[PDB]
Write a protein that binds this DNA or RNA. Structure first.
Ligand SMILES: [Mg+2]
Ligand SMILES: [Mg+2]
Ligand SMILES: [Mg+2]
Ligand SMILES: [Mg+2]
Ligand SMILES: [Mg+2]
Ligand SMILES: [Mg+2]
Ligand SMILES: [Mg+2]
Ligand SMILES: [Mg+2]
Ligand SMILES: [Mg+2]
Ligand SMILES: [Mg+2]
Ligand SMILES: [Mg+2]
Ligand SMILES: [Mg+2]
Ligand SMILES: [Mg+2]
Ligand SMILES: [Mg+2]
Ligand SMILES: [Mg+2]
Ligand SMILES: [Mg+2]
Ligand SMILES: [Mg+2]
Ligand SMILES: [Mg+2]
Ligand SMILES: [Mg+2]
Ligand SMILES: [Mg+2]
Ligand SMILES: [Mg+2]
Ligand SMILES: [Mg+2]
Ligand SMILES: [Mg+2]
Ligand SMILES: [Mg+2]
Ligand SMILES: [Mg+2]
Ligand SMILES: [Mg+2]
Ligand SMILES: [Mg+2]
Ligand SMILES: [Mg+2]
Ligand SMILES: [Mg+2]
Ligand SMILES: [Mg+2]
Ligand SMILES: [Mg+2]
Ligand SMILES: [Mg+2]
Ligand SMILES: [Mg+2]
Ligand SMILES: [Mg+2]
Ligand SMILES: [Mg+2]
Ligand SMILES: [Mg+2]
Ligand SMILES: [Mg+2]
Ligand SMILES: [Mg+2]
Ligand SMILES: [Mg+2]
Ligand SMILES: [Mg+2]
Ligand SMILES: [Mg+2]
Ligand SMILES: [Mg+2]
Ligand SMILES: [Mg+2]
Ligand SMILES: [Mg+2]
Ligand SMILES: [Mg+2]
Ligand SMILES: [Mg+2]
Ligand SMILES: [Mg+2]
Ligand SMILES: [Mg+2]
Ligand SMILES: [Mg+2]
Ligand SMILES: [Mg+2]
Ligand SMILES: [Mg+2]
Ligand SMILES: [Mg+2]
Ligand SMILES: [Mg+2]
Ligand SMILES: [Mg+2]
Ligand SMILES: [Mg+2]
Ligand SMILES: [Mg+2]
Ligand SMILES: [Mg+2]
Ligand SMILES: [Mg+2]
Ligand SMILES: [Mg+2]
Ligand SMILES: [Mg+2]
Ligand SMILES: [Mg+2]
Ligand SMILES: [Mg+2]
Ligand SMILES: [Mg+2]
Ligand SMILES: [Mg+2]
Ligand SMILES: [Mg+2]
Ligand SMILES: [Mg+2]
Ligand SMILES: [Mg+2]
Ligand SMILES: [Mg+2]
Ligand SMILES: [Mg+2]
Ligand SMILES: [Mg+2]
Ligand SMILES: [Mg+2]
Ligand SMILES: [Mg+2]
Ligand SMILES: [Mg+2]
Ligand SMILES: [Mg+2]
Ligand SMILES: [Mg+2]
Ligand SMILES: [Mg+2]
Ligand SMILES: [Mg+2]
Ligand SMILES: [Mg+2]
Ligand SMILES: [Mg+2]
Ligand SMILES: [Mg+2]
Ligand SMILES: [Mg+2]
Ligand SMILES: [Mg+2]
Ligand SMILES: [Mg+2]
Ligand SMILES: [Mg+2]
Ligand SMILES: [Mg+2]
Ligand SMILES: [Mg+2]
Lengths: 127, 205, 260
RNA sequence: CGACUCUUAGCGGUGGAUCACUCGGCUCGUGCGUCGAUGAAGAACGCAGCUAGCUGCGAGAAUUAAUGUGAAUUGCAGGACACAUUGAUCAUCGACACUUCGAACGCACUUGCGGCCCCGGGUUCCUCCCGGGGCUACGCCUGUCUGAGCGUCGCUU
RNA sequence: GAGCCUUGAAGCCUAGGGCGCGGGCCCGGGUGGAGCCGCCGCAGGUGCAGAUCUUGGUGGUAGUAGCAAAUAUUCAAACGAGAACUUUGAAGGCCGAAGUGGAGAAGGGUUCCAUGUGAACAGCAGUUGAACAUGGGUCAGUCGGUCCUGAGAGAUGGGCG
RNA sequence: UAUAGGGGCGAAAGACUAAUCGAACCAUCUAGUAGCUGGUUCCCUCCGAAGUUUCCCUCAGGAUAGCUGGCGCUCUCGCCC
RNA sequence: CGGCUACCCACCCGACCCGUCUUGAAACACGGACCAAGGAGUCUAACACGUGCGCGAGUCGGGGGCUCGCACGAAAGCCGCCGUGGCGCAAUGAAGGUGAAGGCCGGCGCGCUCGCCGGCCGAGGUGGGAUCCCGAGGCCUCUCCAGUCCGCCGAGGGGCACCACCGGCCCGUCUCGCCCGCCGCGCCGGGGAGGUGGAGCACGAGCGCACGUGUUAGGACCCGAAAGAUGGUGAACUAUG
RNA sequence: CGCGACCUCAGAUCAGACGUGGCGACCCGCUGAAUUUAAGCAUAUUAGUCAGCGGAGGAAAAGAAACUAACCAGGAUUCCCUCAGUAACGGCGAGUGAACAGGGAAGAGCCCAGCGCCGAAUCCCCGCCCCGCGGGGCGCGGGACAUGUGGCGUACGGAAGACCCGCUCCCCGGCGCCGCUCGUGGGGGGCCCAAGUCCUUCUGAUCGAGGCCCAGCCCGUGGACGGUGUGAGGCCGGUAGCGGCCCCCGGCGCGCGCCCGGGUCUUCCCGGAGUCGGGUUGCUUGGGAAUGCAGCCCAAAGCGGGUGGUAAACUCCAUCUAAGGCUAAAUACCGGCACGAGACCGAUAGUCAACAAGUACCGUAAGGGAAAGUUGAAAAGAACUUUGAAGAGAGAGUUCAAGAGGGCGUGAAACCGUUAAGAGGUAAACGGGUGGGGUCCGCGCAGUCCGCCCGGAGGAUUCAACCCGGCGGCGGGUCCGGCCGUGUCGGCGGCCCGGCGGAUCUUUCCCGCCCCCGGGGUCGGCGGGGGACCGUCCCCCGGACCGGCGACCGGCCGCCGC
């Protein structure tokens, strides 16, 4: 139950902050869980997704065994786009299907020194 | 406009009262504010007790409330001089000082003097440097407490004179009848006119 | 309202220009200029009886009636038929009002709380609260209340030592204190007989806090138990007693209908 | 027999009532106390690559610098793609900058007409000569400079 | 109420079945796609046929009145799918110098000009326009403002408040 | 350019003062008051009027009494009086 | 085969278009072209009455205080040497002020249209008055006998509430007369008998909360004016320099 | 004649510094109506408000008595409950309307002119040195103000000067570091628990029962939001005296500058003036023979002046010391910056405005002032063929759905078009009664009833009839073994190893005290503590009643499945 009186339970205020949050808040909003072997190996629950993360989709029209690399992250639309996931238009032009990153299981992260510092802070705070 | 048998009503609502409506929606808000004010005072200010300065035994001026008793304001400088301490030294000790309060009664004089003796007996002071003026060792493990509640003495002290056992007595019960009040009333009404008639009888020879 | 539709300055026409006698906003170009002004029957107008802030909201109750309602709710919580008719699952539950030991009030983890409810068979009522946590019916979903979370058992205690932490996120439970008995928590919805779980110190402190009919309440100042209107109130026993049936006329059960 | 008129039902047509939703109001309560002569509130004009409005800014003009976070903004081409160099966006903003009118302040205001001081080139210098920079409103306080009296007085002709 | 359900809630329609005397209600059938109801208590901004009722929409009138102030148009060709109306040739007329002519002040603000479209505008029409979209256009020592005072408006000194 | 609202101006009509002038326009007091028109929203059941006395600057109104409804209380019958 | 029905049609009979001002409306009285949404007796304060609950000669925490910081907690619980205070328990007077118990028995002073001493009872009497109490009497398949058994009543009695009357007490005035006490013997106080005025007493029933009706003042069931005041804007029309 | 000093002044684009203007919800100062009521209207009420003007602060104002009271007296201002709809004002009509107590929040008190004393011991400015970080403040030398009066000592509660007495030894303004603090000091950044598993629907799941006898996992975290629907676990978010870092504020502890108060006696000083007050006149008040303010005139006193609620004279008494000033707290806030909640509203409601809203637009101007939300899960917004020049259309395609095709959720009424059925000279429509037709509903229409008992025909079963074996329930007697409920005594036992209350006591108990002659006197009186007695709980044996919702064992009749 909410006990701190300086945070809202208001539906209008929560939806307002959610649909008008800036991009550095929207990065925290668009976070994705990890696979079970990768969370066993890194001791972390979830990570924010970036341009070069490999993605297995668990739910939707495309489900399972489709590990592909993402290409675009529209934080305005709360939508990542995956290279493997395709859909043809009327005129034979392919286009990427909108997938929300909360229904996204990351199988391979991107190695960077900044992400190593983030992962170390996650592991130290998870303890 | 009027009706059957009901009381004549004159409400004071002809003035535009709707603008000035003060409704206590913030009454628990003021309660929480004043709780936090008292708690912040007792934390940050001192180990002095809440309602810090001591109040006197005071009789209420009326023919209605003068049988009762009241916590006054200050200790009535003649009383404070009989207790024998300086004015601002008393104010820093914790004695509340009012320079206006007079003394008509030696009874109330000695009552406030004995109250000052009791407060000086119950006083435990803490100077800064350990040169020991008016202190000693760790007195009563820092006097077992820090802050008292609502006066150190409970300054009401509703005195209970009892006078239980006495024998029915002699002709006082035949002498203290109703006629004494009427005689005193008539003497108070006719105290001056009898003096004028005595002056006129002494003048006219 | 506090600032009604009286922002629009308007006057009425009168005899000629025979639309109506209602005031009309005056201007040009804008197609509102000429429409209905303030009033109850107009578009965008001042409503009838603008609900002012000085309504008589809060209602004082006599403290004797407050304590009377607390005693009535606690007495109705003891009868099994009343609480089963309110709907708590008291099938496998042991003896009425349950008194647990003093080791219960010092719980820290809520796994011990769930295990205690499973061993004291209130877990059936907690499972009913799990089974009924549906969505709010009506427009009240907009103002942050979207759950029909029905009330279950309430645990009444003293000496808070972590029992609020152990009972804090169980659905349907109610944090309730002996020195602060809430009518709104002991009898929610105006219905009596809510399932309650006491403690040793609670069940021994009730008699100290209210008293019997012999002694007064020692914790309160000037409270006694109320007058009991019917002492031995078994109406079937009274009407089947020999002293009452000795003084009856006769059983007259003939009908004597209409004769054609 | 058909045409016209009336009542139902099915389907179709301006109409957006009802139902459902809410980045909106309304009410109540708490916390803090905050504009300006070091140019306030307000207004005019301008600024995006494609940019009318709202929003954001002031010739450094869709933001500059710094800190924090950490791979984007996005409708479209381009641009930095670098991170074993410094790093895109976003928020904070504590450093710079903030056109004109506006208490508006050189005059009333027609972006006109001046007056001092200094600096660059134009006959290497004022003499009503171009550009740039600073100053030039009223009242008043303290102190400085100058002078007005047949206001009062000292010394001398 | 271990209530109802995306195997279909609210809403709406119904030559379907029924109940209650009536307020109304239940079920069936058709669209709809996410919330709804029953009992017990509680509180209302709680029921519409009217008020020259307010807002919004729609009929009869009705394809009706009306497209009639100022003498008038006609033939051929051309771009064009399309011409009583656009453009040109020709003919006949009007305005007839106190103009239906050539330029100004106030006012308008891009309406001026070219190109393209013709759903929208022009009370029919357009291939046309002052409509729409794109791109252009206003160059001063010697034209005027700027200078001056006119009727008048105005700040300081002063006075009032 | 000057005269601005009980003010201006008028060869005088009370005419003109931004389609309004025998007292302009906009906003506020203001949701001014009205004994005066119009309207006042679901069903069923029971009971059910008056247009009269007196008074009032009273005569389209109100007060009082009368007519009416609701809520009860005190009793009485069921067994030669 | 059956079927009433928000389907359609025909036939017989009755049937003027609703709402309200009115004595009278279908009216040649007024509003209404049609349809959808909105739309009019609310809220506060005060009073009175009725009802429901709690306590009850008391009642009430609305003003504050106490709990550990809690979403519901702007709730709730408690104060009691926090009952200050409101209402009620006492009224009458303009006021000084005064302020609700009498009855029975014995003795005493001339039981004298007259007071004292001692004891007892205690909110008076009359006529009705629900109810309640005592009880003559008689009634149960054959006899003397009994206990509860079936089983009421003539008559008598104490009398709730309340009504009607009489009587008593208290307060302010009116008339008539006498007596008593002295922290001081006075234009000092007190007392008696009668008829009056009071919203009185004559064993008190109030306080708090809630609901319903009615009235008042607040915009007060909704809409409506000719008008008044305050502060600003216009001589681009027109009037005159 | 000239030079100089002082006093009155002018100038400057002299050096430095200050006020203008805006918001104005709360607060302060002025003045300021009428609609309305009084059923009429003048006094009155509206109202000392609305409008107008001038000012500042997070509060403002007020604030240390020229006070209240009249007795067993209190003692700054503010705010609340009472006082109280009362005293009182009012064509005493309508109506208007306080105050002192008393109980609470808050508590903080002071300074100056005069009087004298200090050789102006005082302040402003200029120039250089001593100085530390992010920056300006003490000390050296000369230019002014000020003797027509700076500063210290002083404040009506008395103060000052000189002896006597025992004493007191000191403060506040800096600077680096160490451990803190009640939310575990301020705000900001970044992070932290636990199914996305097996089966089945669905376009999609967050739907649907289950995850071994330990309830599959987490919980101090099951608030809320987004995610293709209805999630505690899939995601930042939620709990936590949860952790790590940076920035800021505070009280401890080394330098620099100042530092005689109390009691007795003697002497001296001891106060705010066109001001109070009086007359008169306006506004206001509840304030009346005038509460306050103001205009004019008259205009002081020093055992004085004011107040003492009925004008005035005489007398007595109570209280205060005005015409100078400051001061935080409780209190108010519809403006503003963030903030949390809602028995509120749902695009004709709620702010005028959910949206490019004070916008479009109107009036010369003051000013007036709108309408307007929704496709889908994602545009995947209809490729391509074909008629027409296009608008548009027929195929085809995406989507669960085009019956969602760019103002596109749902799609009624008024009204219109077509089809089907029926009808038509008394305008249409209606009530009662039937009839005919049509849609639809239930069923098989010469064939539809069930439940029990008994007499007949085959079949397979096992109990029941009686008993043994068994646990569980009903009933009552010994109230048998024992708990407990109602009134009663007793151990006065827990009275000192006990709770509650008593204006009932104990002056031969104690302590702090007064009085009379360190001691004595209950000789009399005040407060607190000890305990004597009165009405209820805590054990017991002995006993009466129901064994009554208080229930076990022992035994009995009558139940019951296996
Ligand atoms: Mg909200
Ligand atoms: Mg009436
Ligand atoms: Mg008014
Ligand atoms: Mg208005
Ligand atoms: Mg208003
Ligand atoms: Mg509105
Ligand atoms: Mg609904
Ligand atoms: Mg619309
Ligand atoms: Mg930068
Ligand atoms: Mg320059
Ligand atoms: Mg219903
Ligand atoms: Mg309504
Ligand atoms: Mg509502
Ligand atoms: Mg309607
Ligand atoms: Mg009607
Ligand atoms: Mg109409
Ligand atoms: Mg029409
Ligand atoms: Mg025609
Ligand atoms: Mg014709
Ligand atoms: Mg024409
Ligand atoms: Mg041709
Ligand atoms: Mg051609
Ligand atoms: Mg010709
Ligand atoms: Mg000419
Ligand atoms: Mg011409
Ligand atoms: Mg052109
Ligand atoms: Mg063209
Ligand atoms: Mg046309
Ligand atoms: Mg154009
Ligand atoms: Mg030239
Ligand atoms: Mg002037
Ligand atoms: Mg001047
Ligand atoms: Mg005027
Ligand atoms: Mg006037
Ligand atoms: Mg005109
Ligand atoms: Mg006139
Ligand atoms: Mg006028
Ligand atoms: Mg009205
Ligand atoms: Mg009459
Ligand atoms: Mg009447
Ligand atoms: Mg009657
Ligand atoms: Mg009746
Ligand atoms: Mg009439
Ligand atoms: Mg008539
Ligand atoms: Mg009629
Ligand atoms: Mg007519
Ligand atoms: Mg008519
Ligand atoms: Mg009509
Ligand atoms: Mg409606
Ligand atoms: Mg009552
Ligand atoms: Mg009292
Ligand atoms: Mg009262
Ligand atoms: Mg009106
Ligand atoms: Mg008038
Ligand atoms: Mg002109
Ligand atoms: Mg003229
Ligand atoms: Mg009237
Ligand atoms: Mg009038
Ligand atoms: Mg007045
Ligand atoms: Mg004002
Ligand atoms: Mg200002
Ligand atoms: Mg400020
Ligand atoms: Mg002040
Ligand atoms: Mg009156
Ligand atoms: Mg008044
Ligand atoms: Mg003083
Ligand atoms: Mg969700
Ligand atoms: Mg969730
Ligand atoms: Mg998580
Ligand atoms: Mg004196
Ligand atoms: Mg005097
Ligand atoms: Mg005097
Ligand atoms: Mg006197
Ligand atoms: Mg007097
Ligand atoms: Mg003073
Ligand atoms: Mg002052
Ligand atoms: Mg203050
Ligand atoms: Mg809608
Ligand atoms: Mg709108
Ligand atoms: Mg979307
Ligand atoms: Mg479907
Ligand atoms: Mg649609
Ligand atoms: Mg749809
Ligand atoms: Mg939807
Ligand atoms: Mg339709
Ligand atoms: Mg047909």
């Amino acid at each position: 139950m909410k006990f701190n009186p300086f945070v809202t339970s208001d539906r209008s205020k929560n939806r307002k902050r959610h649909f008008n949050a800036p991009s550095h808040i929207r990065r925290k909003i668009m976070s994705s869980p990890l696979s079970k072997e990768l969370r066993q190996k890194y001791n972390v629950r979830s990570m924010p997704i970036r341009k070069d993360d490999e993605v297995q989709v668990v739910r939707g029209h495309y489900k399972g065994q489709q590990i592909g690399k993402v290409v675009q992250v529209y934080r305005k639309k709360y939508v990542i786009y995956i290279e493997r996931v395709q859909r043809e238009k009327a005129n034979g032009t392919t286009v990427h299907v909108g997938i929300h990153p909360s229904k996204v299981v990351i199988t391979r992260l991107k190695l960077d020194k900044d992400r190593k510092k983030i992962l170390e802070r996650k592991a130290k705070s998870r303890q | 406009a009027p009706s059957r048998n009901g009381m004549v009503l004159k409400p004071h609502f002809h003035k535009d009262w709707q603008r000035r409506v003060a409704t206590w929606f913030n009454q628990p808000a003021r309660k929480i504010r004043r709780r936090k004010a008292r708690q912040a005072k007792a934390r940050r200010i001192a180990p002095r007790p809440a309602s810090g300065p001591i109040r006197p035994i005071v009789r209420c001026p009326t023919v209605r409330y003068h049988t009762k008793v009241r916590a006054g304001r200050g200790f009535s400088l003649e009383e404070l001089r009989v207790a024998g301490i300086h004015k601002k030294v008393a104010r820093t000790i914790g004695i509340s000082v009012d320079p206006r309060r007079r003394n008509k009664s030696t009874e109330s004089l000695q009552a406030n003097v004995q109250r000052l003796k009791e407060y000086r007996s119950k006083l435990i002071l803490f100077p800064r440097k350990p040169s020991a003026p008016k202190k000693g060792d760790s007195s009563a493990e820092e006097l077992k407490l820090a802050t008292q509640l609502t006066g150190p003495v409970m300054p009401v002290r509703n005195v209970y004179k009892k006078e239980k056992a006495r024998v029915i007595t002699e002709e006082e019960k035949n002498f203290k009848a109703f006629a004494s009040l009427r005689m005193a009333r008539a003497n108070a009404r006719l105290f001056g006119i009898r003096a004028k008639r005595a002056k006129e009888a002494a003048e006219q020879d | 309202s506090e600032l009604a539709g009286h922002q629009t300055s308007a006057e009425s026409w009168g005899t000629g220009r025979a639309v109506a006698r209602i005031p009309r906003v005056r201007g040009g170009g804008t197609h509102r200029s000429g429409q209905g002004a303030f009033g109850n029957m107009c578009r965008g107008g001042r409503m009838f009886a603008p609900t002012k802030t000085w309504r008589r909201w809060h209602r004082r109750v006599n403290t004797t009636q407050k304590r009377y309602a607390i005693c009535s709710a606690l007495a109705a919580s003891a009868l099994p038929a009343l609480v089963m008719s309110k709907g708590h699952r008291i099938e496998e539950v042991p003896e009425l009002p349950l008194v647990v030991e003093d080791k219960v009030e010092g719980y820290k983890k809520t796994k011990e709380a769930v295990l205690l409810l499973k061993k004291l068979k209130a877990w059936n009522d907690i499972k009913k609260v799990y089974a009924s946590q549906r969505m709010r019916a009506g427009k009240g979903k907009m103002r942050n209340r979207r759950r029909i979370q029905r009330r279950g058992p309430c645990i009444i205690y003293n000496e808070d030592n972590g029992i609020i932490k152990a009972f804090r996120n169980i659905p349907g439970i109610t944090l309730l204190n002996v020195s602060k008995l809430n009518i709104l928590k002991l009898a929610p919805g105006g219905h009596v007989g809510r399932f309650c779980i006491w403690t040793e110190s609670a069940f021994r402190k009730l008699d100290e806090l209210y008293g019997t009919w012999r002694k007064a309440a020692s914790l309160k100042s000037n409270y006694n138990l109320p007058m009991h209107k019917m002492i031995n109130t078994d109406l079937s026993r009274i009407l089947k007693s020999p002293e009452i049936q000795r003084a009856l006329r006769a059983p007259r059960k003939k009908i004597h209908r209409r004769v054609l």
